Write a protein that binds this ligand. Structure first.
Ligand SMILES: [Zn+2]
Ligand SMILES: [Zn+2]
Ligand SMILES: [Zn+2]
Length: 72
């Protein structure tokens, strides 16, 4: 219920839950991933080359658990 929305900087890890992502571009930042249900799911970590943004709290990006503990 609050906004992460943050942009990724070069080198930062991004996390896409394989079980819950609507498509492979759906990603959580490290803080949101580790505070979400998806930390216990199958996931893809991809290092950012810069750009994009965290999808925490976008119900269109996730089949379940769209919000991490901080942003719910
Ligand atoms: Zn985030
Ligand atoms: Zn979050
Ligand atoms: Zn998941």
């Amino acid at each position: 219920g609050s906004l992460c929305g943050r942009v990724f900087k070069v080198g930062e890890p991004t996390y896409s839950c394989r079980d819950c992502a609507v498509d492979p571009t759906c990603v959580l930042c490290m803080e949101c991933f580790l505070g979400s249900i998806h930390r216990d799911h199958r996931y893809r970590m991809t290092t950012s080359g810069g750009g994009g943004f965290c999808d925490c709290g976008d119900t269109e990006a996730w089949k379940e658990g769209p919000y991490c503990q901080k942003h719910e």
